[PDB]
Design a protein around this ligand. Structure first.
Ligand SMILES: [Zn+2]
Ligand SMILES: [Zn+2]
Length: 595
């Protein structure tokens, strides 16, 4: 009998959701490798996928492309599936800097930035959950393809307890040390164990307040409980309990003894080479650094930056494809790529960026060439790891369309809101045109978003608008993430009528009160004027029943034709739907937040 997904939604699926859920559920059951969910903004994409996942009962990886989004999906999925394991997997890269060297300014950028507790605790509960139960969803950054110690090792190395087993106290107290746990009775924190004579409390690497308690009565375990840390408040009463390793790079002693000698041999080979080409300075650096590391490994089985040695510790051949979080999933898992037009290129690029950064360190003598083997997957390797995949995006990239059997379309909104109309107007006299349009919106109590290509034009426009008597706020290209919310929140309140910015694709810009979106320089060259970015931008006017977009330009580029055509196509279909079902489109109300 399996642990299944139980989806908790106050609603039912609606619009063209029911049809889309069915195709993707049927796809996955027929056994399709690649499917694409082309879903317009404002339809329940996340809730459509949550319906797919709940119906297929597969462990699932959902890949997001940044800390913000992964966080959104996470909290969302955690509300949709509160009785199942919704997990969170990010790393150093989220907002930390790795090891690096700049050969001109002679600067070694240390890895220094302390390993933040919350994230670590989280990777562990994610990897342990994968082995413990089935109803798991893991929201991850592209870090789900970085080097991770072998899954079998982490698995095989668990201390697998059961009520009344033939085990000793100090035999277990040594077993937890083998698995990178420390004794700290004077300060109980996660990843620690406490010995109080015959009371042994272990703080799983995966937990917050929920620690474990194993007690003896001879050479046999008596009771095992889930006490609340620094409280003793009995919560659990398990008979079986598995305590997973405290690091994703732990290795049996025997493999470690042998890895170390392989490392010694690599060091000697690399030193001889370097000193043979006259890179004497580079030999000295590598020798000082590697020996110090090898000294920590021989003394206590680990060191800092042990990641660098992962291929050696795994005892695999040079050049081997790293193991990653993907290998930790069963063979029959499910991948959902959220915002695929951006997420897939990000994944695709990780390997070259990382290799570039590590090749410099190997050249200058900070690392052994084997450090290149601790790395993210190349896109091809990611490709072979796919069991079954769904791409989700309002504007699928070339890869997705190319490998999917057409697209599963989800265009209808639950309130009948339509994609906007689009006028394209000349650049000459654009500011007064725009002023007068904003004036109309202000009279109808509606707001406006404006995007210009450059920070100077943006700055000029804001002034030009303030002089006109219109309340406008400038959303500076790098402003306090906490102030963003404040200015946006104020536009909703009408403290501001217009809001000028360069990039309108950054989140929190979905505002029901916005009924007009002006795109200055619609025809210029720039990542923000592509087919995909324009559609994404036009969408900022899809939250209002009177949404309209104005592109100012001298010409009609290929990107413009495409976005305009697509927008026309979506609207007609939406209109055809409202006609058939008796729906009048109306603006989705939303309450405004505070502190
Ligand atoms: Zn219908
Ligand atoms: Zn292909």
């Amino acid at each position: 009998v399996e642990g299944r997904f139980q989806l908790v939604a106050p609603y039912e699926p609606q619009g063209d959701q029911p049809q889309a859920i069915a195709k993707l559920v049927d796809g996955l059951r027929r056994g399709v490798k690649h499917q694409t969910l082309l879903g317009a903004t404002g339809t329940g994409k996340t809730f459509t996928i949550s319906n797919v996942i709940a119906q297929v009962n597969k462990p699932t990886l959902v890949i997001a492309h940044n800390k913000t989004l992964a966080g959104q999906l996470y909290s969302e999925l955690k509300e949709f599936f509160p009785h199942n394991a919704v997990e969170y997997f990010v790393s150093y890269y989220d907002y930390a800097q790795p090891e690096a060297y700049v050969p001109q300014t002679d600067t070694y950028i240390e890895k220094d930035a302390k390993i933040n507790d919350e994230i670590d605790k989280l990777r562990h509960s994610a990897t342990s959950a994968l082995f413990e139960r089935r109803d798991v969803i893991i929201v991850a950054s592209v870090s789900c393809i970085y080097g991770l110690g072998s899954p079998e090792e982490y698995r095989e190395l668990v201390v697998s307890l059961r009520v009344g087993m033939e085990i000793e106290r100090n035999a277990l107290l040594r077993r937890l040390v083998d698995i990178q746990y420390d004794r700290n009775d004077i300060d109980f924190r996660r990843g620690t164990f406490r010995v109080r004579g015959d009371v042994v409390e272990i703080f799983p690497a995966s937990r917050d307040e929920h620690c474990i308690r194993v007690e003896f009565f001879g050479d046999e375990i008596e009771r095992i409980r889930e006490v609340d840390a620094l409280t003793g408040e009995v919560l659990g009463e398990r008979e079986h309990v598995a305590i997973f390793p405290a690091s994703h790079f732990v290795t049996r002693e025997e493999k470690m003894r042998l890895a170390i000698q392989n490392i010694e041999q690599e060091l000697e080979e690399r030193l001889a080479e370097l000193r043979a080409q006259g890179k004497l300075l580079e030999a000295q650096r590598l020798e000082q650094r590697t020996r110090y590391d090898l000294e920590m490994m021989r003394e206590m089985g680990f060191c800092s930056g042990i990641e660098n040695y992962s291929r050696h510790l795994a005892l695999r051949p040079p050049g081997s494809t790293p193991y990653t979080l993907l290998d930790y999933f069963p063979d029959d898992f499910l991948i959902i790529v959220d915002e695929s037009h951006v997420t897939l290129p990000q994944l695709r690029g990780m390997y070259n960026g990382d290799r570039a950064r590590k090749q410099v360190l190997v050249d200058h003598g900070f690392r052994l060439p084997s450090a290149l083997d601790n790395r993210p997957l190349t896109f091809e390797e990611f490709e072979q790891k796919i069991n079954q995949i769904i791409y989700v995006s309002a504007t699928p990239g070339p890869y997705e369309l190319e490998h999917s059997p057409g697209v599963v379309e989800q265009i209808i909104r639950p309130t009948g809101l339509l994609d906007p109309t689009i006028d394209v107007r000349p650049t000459k006299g654009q500011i007064d045109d725009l002023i007068g349009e904003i004036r109309e919106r202000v009279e109808r109590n509606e707001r406006t978003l404006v995007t210009t290509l450059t920070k100077k034009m943006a700055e000029d426009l804001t002034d030009y608008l303030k002089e006109a008597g219109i309340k406008v706020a400038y959303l500076h290209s790098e402003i306090k993430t906490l102030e963003r919310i404040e200015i946006i929140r104020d536009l909703r309140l009408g403290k501001y009528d217009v809001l000028v910015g360069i990039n309108l694709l950054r989140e929190g810009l979905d505002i029901p009160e916005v009924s007009l979106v002006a795109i200055l320089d619609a025809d210029k060259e720039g990542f923000l004027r592509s087919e995909r970015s324009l559609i994404q931008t036009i969408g900022r006017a899809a939250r209002n029943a009177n949404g309209h977009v104005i592109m100012y330009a001298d010409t009609i580029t290929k990107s413009m034709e495409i976005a305009i055509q697509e927008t026309k196509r979506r609207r007609a279909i939406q209109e055809e739907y409202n006609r058939k079902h008796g729906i009048v489109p109306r603006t989705v109300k939303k309450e405004i937040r505070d502190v």
